[PDB]
């Protein structure tokens, strides 16, 4: 299946069927976070998806082709996390992002809490465009989770 949309990334290596992450299918390319697949091959029915591009520091990986997602958060508007949690239905959660201030620049950050298996869930702008993926961030004093809006680069 190469239909555009959001997909669960599953494994049968552990007890039963376990959801390790999520990814986006766009323009024939599957996009997810590196920590979900570790760059390993993926299966889609009888078909095989081989990795094309990856980077541990950006924590991103693309299958079948180069990274296609290039929309960006405008730094002002609210966004939607299309959370796809393990064993539960896809769900849009609107929020206004915060900021990760780094030595190399500021990045948007969504302060929403989901299981680690939700990694790779897309973050969308008002037009439905994918401005980045959820699943790489930090744990604050509160014990809560805050993820960066991790976006790749389209060549």
């Amino acid at each position: 299946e190469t239909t555009d949309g959001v997909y669960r990334v599953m494994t049968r290596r552990l007890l039963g069927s376990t959801q390790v992450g999520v990814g986006v299918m766009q323009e024939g390319v599957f996009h997810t976070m590196w920590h979900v697949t570790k760059g390993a091959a993926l299966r889609s029915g009888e078909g095989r998806l081989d990795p094309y591009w990856g980077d541990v520091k950006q924590d991103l990986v693309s299958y079948c082709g180069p990274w296609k997602l290039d929309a960006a958060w405008d730094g002002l508007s609210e966004v939607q996390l299309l959370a796809v949690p393990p064993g539960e239905r896809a769900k849009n959660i609107q929020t206004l992002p915060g900021i990760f201030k780094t030595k190399d620049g500021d990045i948007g950050a969504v302060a929403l809490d989901y299981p680690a298996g939700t990694s790779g869930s897309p973050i969308l702008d008002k037009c439905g465009r994918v401005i980045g993926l959820y699943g790489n961030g930090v744990v604050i004093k509160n014990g809560s989770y805050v993820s960066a809006i991790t976006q790749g680069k389209r060549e």
Partner: protein
């Protein structure tokens, strides 16, 4: 072996559940792609 299953369309839902705060955090990103907090 890992596999994928379709979970839905990528669309904006008008009148979705609005939650979450907007924190400004000082962070660092290491060679392993792991974020950490500074102070």
């Amino acid at each position: 072996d890992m596999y994928i299953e379709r979970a839905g369309d990528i669309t904006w839902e008008k009148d979705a559940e609005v939650t979450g705060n907007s924190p400004r955090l000082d962070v660092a990103l290491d060679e392993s792609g792991d974020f950490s907090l500074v102070e």
